[PDB]
Amino acid sequence: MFLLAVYFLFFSAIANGFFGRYLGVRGSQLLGPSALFLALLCSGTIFYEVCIQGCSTNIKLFENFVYSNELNVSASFLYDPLAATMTLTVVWISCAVHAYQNLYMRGDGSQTLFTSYLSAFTGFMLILVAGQNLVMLFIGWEGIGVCSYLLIGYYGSRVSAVKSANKSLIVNKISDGFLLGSMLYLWFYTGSFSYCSLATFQIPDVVSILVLLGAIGKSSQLFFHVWLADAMEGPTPVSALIHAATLVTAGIYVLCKLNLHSQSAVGILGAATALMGGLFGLAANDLKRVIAFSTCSQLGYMMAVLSTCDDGADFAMGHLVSHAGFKATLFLSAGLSIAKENNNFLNRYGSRQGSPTLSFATTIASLNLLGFPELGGFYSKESILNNAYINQGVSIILTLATFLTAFYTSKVLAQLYLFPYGNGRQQKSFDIDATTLICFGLLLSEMLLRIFTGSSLSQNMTTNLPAHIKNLPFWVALSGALSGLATTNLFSSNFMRFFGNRGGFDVFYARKCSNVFYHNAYVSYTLLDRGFLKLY
Amino acid sequence: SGHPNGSFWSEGTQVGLNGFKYGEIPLPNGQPR
Amino acid sequence: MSLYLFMLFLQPLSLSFVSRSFSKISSLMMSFATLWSAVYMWFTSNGANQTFYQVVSWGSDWSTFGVCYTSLYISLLCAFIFPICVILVQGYRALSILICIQTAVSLSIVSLHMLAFYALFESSLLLFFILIGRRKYGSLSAAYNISIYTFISALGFLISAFWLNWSFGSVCALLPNEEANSFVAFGIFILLWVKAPLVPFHLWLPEAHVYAPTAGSVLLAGVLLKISIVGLHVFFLPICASSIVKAFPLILSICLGSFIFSSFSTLKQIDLKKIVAYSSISHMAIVFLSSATNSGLGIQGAVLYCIAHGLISPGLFLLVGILYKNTNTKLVFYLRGLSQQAPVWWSVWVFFMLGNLAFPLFPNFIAEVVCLSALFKNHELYAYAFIFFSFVGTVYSSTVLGRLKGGVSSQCVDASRLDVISWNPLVLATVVTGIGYM
Amino acid sequence: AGAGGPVKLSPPVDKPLPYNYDFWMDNGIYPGQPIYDGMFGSMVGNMSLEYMAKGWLVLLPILSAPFVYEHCIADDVTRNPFVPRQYPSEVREFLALFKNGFVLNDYSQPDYEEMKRRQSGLLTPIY
Amino acid sequence: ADRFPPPKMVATQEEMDNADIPYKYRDYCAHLIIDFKECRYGHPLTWRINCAHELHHYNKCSYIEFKRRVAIAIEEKKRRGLM
Amino acid sequence: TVMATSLPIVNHPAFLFVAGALTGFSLTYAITSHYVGRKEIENLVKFDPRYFPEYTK
Amino acid sequence: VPEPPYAKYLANKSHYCPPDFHYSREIYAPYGGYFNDPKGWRTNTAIATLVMLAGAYAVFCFGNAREERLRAPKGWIPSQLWNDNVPTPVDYRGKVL
Amino acid sequence: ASEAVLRLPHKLRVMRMYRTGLKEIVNWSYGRHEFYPRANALRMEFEANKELSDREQIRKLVLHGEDLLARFRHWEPTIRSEFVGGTVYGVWPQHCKDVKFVPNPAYIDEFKQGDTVLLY
């Protein structure tokens, strides 16, 4: 029963991408959503069996996947509470994205290949989450990396999309290299790759740094966030999957599965990434970019909370699962707005008659991001902010990030709906089928269920804080939202420009790192092999 | 736009070969290659 | 073993008696018969015989032949990859040269005598000079490079073999001999240094590969580079272990430098064949270092990675040859829109390039993991150095794929039925090894 | 219309090419781009590397000020008004083993010095 | 620390293991966390309304423990002379 | 005029002032709250007679 | 330009194809063409669904044989209906069910 | 100012400065409502100095306005999607005809396909 979900996704991938000539566009519009629905039924069974009823299961497919001398690893799947929760969230979001793609990608030539890549992408994410050993996780990590390369660069005749895919691939190579080094350290000194025997009470700092460096790649933290903003070249369904669940979450999942992180580093890196991402999102004028910077900020919050307390891992995973739903909703709604208006710029959006479902889903997702009380996003974010009070540095930065988050989120909501119409007087239209309505029904259902069921066991446990300190996140969010509605100026033009250039990390890489890389290549080749050592 | 006859479950509008596999042209009378 | 050797001797023999019009058919059938004989040799090789599975002697120390773990894998790889080379080559002259080269190489792998090893491997010296220097599509410079580099390295190896034969009285591997001499170790080592391209003795390889025919390039990358690992495991580590341990800091410096400089040089390449050639040079460094550690994990990892390369590099060279036949260009700048224009060629190209980058479902991943584990067994820094610099391979491969993937093109340049037939065995073998049937 | 939109084709090369022309990516559509944007040519927003560095110089102190206080100026005794969570002896001893744990900062404990030395552990494996 | 002695531990090792209580949660309030955990998992979606008595009791015990921790801190600080 | 048609209150001076005051108070309070909150938490125990008889009088 | 003779064998433009969009119809891709919609798609999809259900049956058999639960579930689990290796549930207190 | 702008005559330079300033007003605005007052302000700014005849003062004004328009260049220009610099530019470019397709490729001299070694 547990294997079935992975089978359904890989089957949908093979069918759509190898037998699409027979199935057709309509055949992929059937087999994709059907397989994802079946996988949702299996994931729901897994979630009930493991999470609610505390029944972890291990399925060993085969032994001796790698058998060289002492080194021995097997392909085995352990469904633990973290795996069940992530499997459920991933499959729910993927099923929604598959339903969404039926209408969105009708205007794209390869809808069969797109559906195939989406299902293979979901399968590799489930392999990463459910792996019982570090090698299976690496298999999933690389599979999602390759699927992202094949999906971001889907538009090959655009130089920006191919460059965005190359950027993703290179950054992910650097990260998985650090991970491979850490896995080698852990195998050598613990004797196994299985997480049960992997447990080490005291680990040398080197392994901790290598683990963190590996994780900061997929979960785009500071210095490694360049690829996320660029990943906007790909079609909207890809962005929803990568940002909401498949890619950003993997780093957090790795850090939570093996608690080798160092408190000092994770807190500072997280709080910095939260603030920087919020500031970058303030300057952004593309709808899809703002939601990416919001993803960066939220990832910063999840990374930061690990430092605060022992329950930080539970709080981080709880935020991760709460975030995937609303963030997916934000991307799908942004895509539909872009499709309906033929515009990507916030300036040209405005009030216009539309579907009630889409406008409500956008409002509720934005409210969850903002932190509106009595919402799934609110509980998962307050759990972090309240517990971070002990670390004075992390708390102050995270509150400032909450303010900036509220400001941009409110500005975006005002610009997309409240603001008067800003596009031209030309005939534009995108009619929504019942499949899109089902997709939004699924996202809203996830959002509602999250409030009733919660995200962590310790979510509502009392944090012994004065009332003024416990309710401050709300006041900061409200103040930011009010300032964002008024569309006031917060920073001087020098800083607004700085934030628009994203801190100039990419300008540094191009002017110095890329030039050094190609000078090393020039010395290695032109000066030496084909110069000094080449005959006349 | 929409579906060809307004129904999703209708026969495909394309009759013929989507492409030539390996670049080979089908024999007119159905003679095997 | 006897069946394999007999089939090997029959394949060059068959050409003398064929009709000159049936040459290609006979050569293909002989290649398949040699593959089947290799499978029989594998069947008749019992794991119970831990040291050497089978040893045969035909009256002298020179005619002593035997199969071990390294020898068995390399011989099976040569027999698997030869049919592809055969079908890709046309003409009696070309067939004769290729069949003689293959017979010499396949006899070298199973040889257990250093002098016989030298006699068989270096017999195919003029044939490569003539093949790489062919009238219209060949370069005399590349032929001279490969020939001179081979002659100098093999002559040094020969001098070391003569000293070992004088001092011990025999040069057969089956007789346990140990030597602490550094001159003799260097003599044996220099051959390995040149044959498996290691900086700064790697210049001969790219020239030869670019100006060789596709059958020649496939054979060269697929198995000719591997002949170094057979010499290391069979003729160097047993006798000159002390010198490898004495020089380990230098060996590591030269191997890592080769990996780095080759990776950086691959970045400045505009020709697809040169890109594949420099990728091979970079990949050889890990195999050489892993074997030099003289550990179980290293010898197994090196042989496994060699098989993975011997399955991934012929695929890329085959696809490059097919593309060149379709377009008469190897410049990445002229080739654009290949995704839209050749969806079937593109799929296989992307798959093989993913294999070259050591992704998990490919044999390269397992092999790399084992080799890195062996390096980590030696020192953690040794492993880290290799793991970090692997990104350079990604940068060049990504740039190439991106340039080829999109653009505007007015030519439909896709593979024919013959081209798919030629890569299907390589694809299936890659998949099978990737899933763990190494 | 997503598919079939008009595009401008890049003009064919008509002059001797520079040696380092591989730095330019041209697929045949008119707007070709550098291999890495910002390496050369027009810079986004007309902002040089010097401008970005001056910005980071202005920003860095303000961002680092919260972190430097608690981490360096503050001490375990004064960081928080309470002690770390109190556990039974059997639970506490096991929890103290974890280097990345939160019970190692309990000054009240008579094993504080050992726990503090455990927290500041080895940089690299000794063997 | 000595002035404010630890409370008696109602939960035994066997009970904490049987309820699958992690080590971090074994902090003198484990019996109440066992009650809350059993009720929350028993009512998967309705726990927020139904399981409120157990949460209240846990929060109260946690409050008392927090007050003890602050008292211990103040006593240590006075012993060192800082305040 | 920011949102004349839909939400004209934003342009009103009172709204701008109230929003700015909320921003100021919340942001400055976030920094200052650490000292203030830590004081209310130390004081809660120190002035409780059962926990500390000496301070109470 | 007079369409080549083979053009009769090739398929027409599908309903979903935008009228302005021009693509070469001779190119073959395994994933399908530019807009597909082949005749006989309904049968192909039914065959696909049957192969999916058969493979699901095989996967279910394999998983059930290899699913090892070594710790008793806290309460009743759905796996009991189909798999007989589930340990008898024990609750939080410890009572067997 | 770039070389192409500098070569332009005075009249074309001022027209270009007005055009660019209006586009930058659009880029820095949050809605169409902001554009109208800002565009009227820009118009008044140009109208105020239009009757100046002193060449030196005119040069100073032009140079300063060019420096202002260089500094205030937006990181994200507001460009229509279908135009160069737009998201949908090049997504599925229209294929040109006259494509060279080789029919039955493997059946052209099937037995003798391969590479030959020519010798002297």
Ligand SMILES: CCCCCCCCCCCCCCCCCC(=O)OC[C@H](COP(=O)([O-])OCC(O)COP(=O)([O-])OC[C@@H](COC(=O)CCCCCCCCCCCCCCCCC)OC(=O)CCCCCCCCCCCCCCCCC)OC(=O)CCCCCCCCCCCCCCCCC
């Ligand atoms: C008992 C019952 C009966 C059952 C049968 C059992 C009998 C057993 C053996 C009997 C088989 C007949 C032997 C064949 C004799 C003639 C062969 C020949 O002429 O070759 C080309 C000839 C093709 O003739 P063609 O196409 O009509 O045109 C040639 C024209 O005459 C001129 O054309 P061109 O001017 O355009 O020249 C172009 C040239 C391009 O120019 C070059 O490349 C020159 C390169 C110099 C030599 C190549 C150096 C490397 C050769 C390595 C040896 C190959 C085997 C590798 C195994 C390693 C062995 C250590 O390319 C070639 O000629 C072919 C390239 C590769 C062939 C080279 C191999 C021949 C080596 C010596 C041949 C024997 C001649 C002895 C003379 C006897 C009285 C005069 O025959 C072949 O089919 C290919 C060669 C077959 C090699 C088997 C011969 C044994 C040699 C291996 C040495 C082992 C020791 C001997 C023991 C053998 C068993 C006891």
Ligand SMILES: CCCCCCCCCCCCCCCCCC(=O)O[C@@H](COC(=O)CCCCCCCCCCCCCCC)COP(=O)(O)OCC[N+](C)(C)C
């Ligand atoms: C042009 C192509 C068009 C056609 C496409 C073909 C579609 C291929 C389908 C993909 C295959 C996926 C199956 C992956 C498992 C590989 C099957 C296998 O290796 O058989 C195993 C038996 O194991 C199985 O059958 C696995 C069950 C397969 C299906 C179960 C769930 C399916 C979901 C896919 C997830 C698999 C993740 C594994 C990642 C490593 C052999 O058993 P042993 O005797 O132990 O062999 C020794 C082990 N070793 C190979 C290392 C030497």
Ligand SMILES: CCCCCCCCCCCCCCCCCC(=O)O[C@@H](COC(=O)CCCCCCCCCCCCCCC)COP(=O)(O)OCC[N+](C)(C)C
């Ligand atoms: C792990 C257990 C089960 C494993 C199943 C894996 C999922 C399916 C794997 C199928 C084969 C793996 C690799 C297929 C060949 C690689 C080429 C490829 O994937 O795509 C080809 C073409 O695709 C195919 O024809 C075959 C794809 C069928 C299924 C692919 C699913 C996604 C691949 C999985 C990634 C492989 C994992 C390797 C590392 C873990 C090229 O696509 P583009 O470069 O994007 O250009 C297409 C044109 N356009 C511009 C419009 C986008």
Ligand SMILES: CCCCCCCCCCCCCCCCCCCC(=O)O[C@H](COC(=O)CCCCCCCCCCCCCC)COP(=O)(O)OCCN
């Ligand atoms: C006690 C002794 C003291 C030391 C004294 C040393 C004195 C000299 C020793 C040098 C011996 C090395 C022999 C190689 C000479 C270089 C090659 C000749 C250069 C050359 O022009 O060859 C052309 C092509 O060669 C090529 O294309 C080959 C390129 C270069 C070959 C690289 C050499 C192999 C690797 C070198 C060392 C490797 C390990 C060393 C242990 C063919 O010219 P042509 O046919 O047109 O004739 C027309 C006349 N110009």
Ligand SMILES: CCCCCCCCCCCCCCCCCCCC(=O)O[C@H](COC(=O)CCCCCCCCCCCCCC)COP(=O)(O)OCCN
């Ligand atoms: C500068 C860096 C070195 C470059 C080599 C890098 C990596 C190569 C390592 C190869 C591994 C095995 C080879 C064994 C030794 C070769 C080089 C080792 C380094 C070396 O030169 O040591 C020398 C001794 O070696 C010797 O006495 C023999 C040196 C090699 C001879 C050169 C040509 C020989 C060709 C002979 C052909 C066949 C002859 C067979 C009879 C002197 O070191 P030391 O111990 O005196 O320390 C005194 C310092 N204070």
Ligand SMILES: CCCCCCCCCCCCCCCCCCCC(=O)O[C@H](COC(=O)CCCCCCCCCCCCCC)COP(=O)(O)OCCN
């Ligand atoms: C919150 C955690 C921190 C996140 C990021 C913090 C980064 C802080 C580092 C910047 C602050 C110190 C900068 C050094 C002082 C330089 C002051 C003026 C700079 C200058 O004059 O030259 C520049 C050197 O580039 C440079 O300044 C490069 C030096 C940067 C050191 C490497 C640190 C990584 C930087 C990554 C992001 C920083 C983006 C902007 C630096 C531009 O040189 P030129 O191109 O005009 O020369 C002409 C080409 N012949």
